[model samples]
Target chain A: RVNSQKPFNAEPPAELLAERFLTPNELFFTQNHLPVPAVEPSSYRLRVDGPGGGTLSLSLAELRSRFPKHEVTATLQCAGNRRSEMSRVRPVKGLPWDIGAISTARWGGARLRDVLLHAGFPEELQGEWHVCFEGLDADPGGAPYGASIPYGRALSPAADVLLAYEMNGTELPRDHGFPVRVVVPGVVGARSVKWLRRVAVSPDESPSHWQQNDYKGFSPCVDWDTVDYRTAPAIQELPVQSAVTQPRPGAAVPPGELTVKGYAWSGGGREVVRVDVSLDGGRTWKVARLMGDKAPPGRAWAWALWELTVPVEAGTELEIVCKAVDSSYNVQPDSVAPIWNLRGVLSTAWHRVRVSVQD
Target chain B: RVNSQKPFNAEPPAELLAERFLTPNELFFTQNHLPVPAVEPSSYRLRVDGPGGGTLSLSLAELRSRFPKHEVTATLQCAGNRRSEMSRVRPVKGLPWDIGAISTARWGGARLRDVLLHAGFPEELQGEWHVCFEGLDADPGGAPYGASIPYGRALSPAADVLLAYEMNGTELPRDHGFPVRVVVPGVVGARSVKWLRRVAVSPDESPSHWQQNDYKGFSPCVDWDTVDYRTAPAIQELPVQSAVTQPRPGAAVPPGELTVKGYAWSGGGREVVRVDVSLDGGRTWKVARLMGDKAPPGRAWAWALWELTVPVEAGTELEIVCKAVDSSYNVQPDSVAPIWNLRGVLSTAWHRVRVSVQD
Candidate 1:
């Protein structure tokens, strides 16, 4: 829950983070840099650049007053959640998030498609593959905040793209973009930039550092001098992620029984179909009692919190393990090394925990 | 700062973690598993094994009453301190400790040399290079806690090897050791295993998993399956080390003047003769103001905190840098690759801290 303020950090407890519907806002972890900008409710405005190089500015009041507000219960995750595990498998850079970087929350705002249509975007590229957005914040360098999303996701009818003004039932937290923000359901949190002041329509990908140089995967052997950030595409949707969050670390276990708790979610609206939980390491696995029913027909925005209780021998120390499967049948990598990277991002593997029982 | 409870975590602030003379115990990052053990003073006993084959056990009362108590200041550092940085340079395995794993403190207890002499270790192995110690605890495996020291270091008349019962003038905390613990001044913390137990004299090194399978250095190209831990000697005396400690991540450096602080220490009892501070990254360097020298003549077992101040010009961000030279003229590596290993331990590079001047 804490780390140096330098790389501002926040994460949803893994189990609650990747559920099947609606991430609770209060439980949503948010990491912010600089101070959470001082944004006033009255001055909240979202600006856009049309394909024809035209400017369009709309206030939060107008966003709510003019366009119909849409709500999406989606998961937002950072690339570094399982960095610690990845680091252990092999060293990597960046924050040492355990497994809480992902969270589920109900986002309320205007539809991004509606905003784009009003902003003069070409209606013809209806089924394209690229969508771009930029934020007002910049780093010490001249670099500005920016990223690109696939047009299929931006334009897909199933994608719950929102120009969000409220998170949960409350106004958005400042650290999470107080005045306004974009909630790209089922996408990586980095793409859902906070304090989102501008949007652009283009067939090209984002040129921001996060899109071009940062937020990509690389081999563990790759050092900065040898890295070609171009080799990998920027991460947009997350992979299947799950981790044991309850009976927190060091929680006592009895010989009689053990109850395991955690969350599961997948990217690109691919719902987590089932979670497999194991108490005796991976010796045997059992289907868990998922907290919520499977999501409605298509777009699955929320995470699935699942739990399982089992009885085992009293004397043996245990390594708790959990992994999930998306609707597509994709599962977490069996081990950490294959996914280990220089930046320690996207470290989803068989999450394991060790615990001992007392006499 | 927090990372999940597994695989442990520790970090020195890329910016300010270097300034404090003694890393405040609270901020002295730790990544241990199996909660800290509680050793009660009334029943605590230290067992010593003789070189000739006999073993002797002494209660806390006997250990304190019979041996001449000695106090020595030393810096006990975890090998994983700067592993993240090394991981960035080349792949390694282990926790992500920034710069905070090394800390100096005054240890209060009895001399190990005194006890070893009484333990009847052969007086003949005077020129050997390894002195190993094991703790009272054990992993789930049958492996006993263990570490080693150089025989020259053990025999060094100036080496202040002691059995500490107190830290910073207070009773040892549970997280640390209680009752009695060995304080191998001028050596790494792993060698100063907690929970005073048995000591053995041998021509070779430790046989435990930590010494045999872990904590060895390998080429950056080494992979787990292809490498042999036996080829490398376990890390004993560390190279000269230092790191930045403050203006940590998320810290706001209000526009103008900035001060840099951090600590520097050397292993093998070598004194940190001088430290150079850099404000424009390493573009230029200046002599830092070192605190009063508290190191014993030939045994500089403790660390010295240093500071430097500089101005931040408009249109520029600050990149603070620090480097130290030992009396033996040893300097840390500039980057992490030459010394990178599969297990990311012992990363001692010139620490760099980057931040911007915000108006």
Candidate 2:
């Protein structure tokens, strides 16, 4: 709910990103695509629906009293980050978003399971499925509503998903889903629908355009004329993604060693397996040790803030490269050519940066 | 002559070039493809052969007094100046040269006819044609000397081309044919052969690789692989090429009017026909007057300095476009895409520049 339309591109200075543990909300990066809607607390309503179309609406106070609060720390990233990598393979269409669209936030609110169970006595119903949510906002054409979440994760007691009405112990900022919003952990941030005006219990997925057409996986060579959106299902869990956002292009590097730092994360509660760092134009590389958990052992939800201090050779041209492997042993590609698409989305590759070690 | 190498890329800086009617010995830009061979003045000998094998050897001084001397003012240019504009359309290969690849000068040398006629002329040479000259310098495989000139212009009584032992009233610099060199009047600077070593008689062109195999023109679509070098004749005269070389890339223009300046010239002595400049991203255009010339009729071998002043809007974005037409009515293309070649040579498309009009 921190953003509805576009994933925000929030980046604190390098110093802030170098933190050892959880990224503080003040320092958490944020991306937003559309204008945040203002919801007056007195007029705000959180609606719940049953499979038979029965609906119950409650005010902020009623929800607070109806269910115990829930909290979870998770990271969210835009699908289009690192899009510039794709353009290098071939000319592409879209903004050249270089790697600044992700952030981790700690959410606190009523648990999604509590809110759903309180709506009716359907707890014993058979074939419980995806818990779908709807946004009050619509696309330009007035297409109504948004996305859904898997039933097991949404209703699981240990899921840590939340229908939060508060952020950082304070009322949610209008831009962060003012009155209230649902936060689905272990999934793509886009599915954590915002402007939460209603929820639906369905045996199927959300019928919104975003759920049907927008978020999905695609082959690198897929061109507009040949793309088959139906061939790929909408993305619920995100693949592992990471990038180093400091040391902006053309910035000078001192003639000494510098710490290589960045964040990496995976969806579906998966863990980051390993991160490799290179600085001699990829001629050589060093394994970056995770601050807390070792690769394949632990990938703390949200992103693992990583740091590796390495020696810098004076007066040598270097290109910094970072790539991560997930708990499933899936490694990011070394280049974008094998993964380019017409819309230029999902541009993750080995995050490479060109720089010189000055004398 | 002026320069045996066609389309010289080094133009003497303005003031250094204007030192005298003929550029001074050391100041003359020697745009040579091969290293200049050191010729010990004492051992340097100029040789000639008659059609029936009549031989003549003139040690430096003998040639000076043997024939009439002549000089002319002309500007030479590289065919690839302003090439970056073409690269923007589709990347090409080659050095990024600017407008400085041209300069004018005077010469004090002997007539080329004196030497050709000195050798027994082949009687009834079909028609007066270019008198080609050869040099002592060899190609990698030892192919000696190169270049050619129009025979009519070569033998014309009014054509002030020369075989000179001096430049701008100074002794010839070792780099520029210390003893003697051909100076074909009003021909391409390249046709002016340096280090005059031999002469030949025929109604044909110079047989050297430089005079035949390369330096030719064809449709932009004809790449080296597809181009039949023999189909197109070697380029003796260059097309008009020019570009604004100051306030280079990423330059900031303060609020107010800005001045655009550059140099323009045509090969084959064809004068520049018109220069249309655009400032509002080609939304509108204005004609800039030629500076040095009075807009003479017929071919123009020299360049004219030009300037145009334009008032800019308050916004922070601006794109400048410049294109010129030559006396032969050949206009530069509007963009580089249609003209781009793999080699990236001869890339004279309309020069367009985008800059910020800093508020």
Best by TM-score: 1
Which numbered prediction scores highest in lDDT against the true structure?
A: 1
User: How many steric overlaps are in each model, in order?
Assistant: 47, 30
After best superposition, candidate 1 residue A30: deviation in angstroms?
1.4
lDDT of 2: 0.63
Model 2, A177-214: lDDT tens per residue? 76777887756667777788888777787887668777
> How does candidate 1 fare on TM-score?
0.49
Worst 10 residues of 1 chain B by lDDT: B7-16
What candidate 2 gets wrong by more than 4 Å, as runs, is: A1-33, A91-95, A121-128, A292-299, B1-359
Question: What share of the reference contacts survives in each candidate?
Answer: 0.00, 0.00
Instruction: Please tell me what DockQ candidate 2 reaches.
Output: 0.00
Each model's TM-score for chain A is 0.92, 0.87
Candidate 1 local lDDT, A1-359, one digit each (tens): 66646646666555455443565666677766444557666776678877777888898788889888788777777778778888786667777788787777788898888888888765446334467776666677745677778665565445778878899878888778777888888777888878887887766788777888888755434677888876555676666678888666665677877777888877666667667776677755666877875664337777888888887676677788887755433345456654456888877777888887766
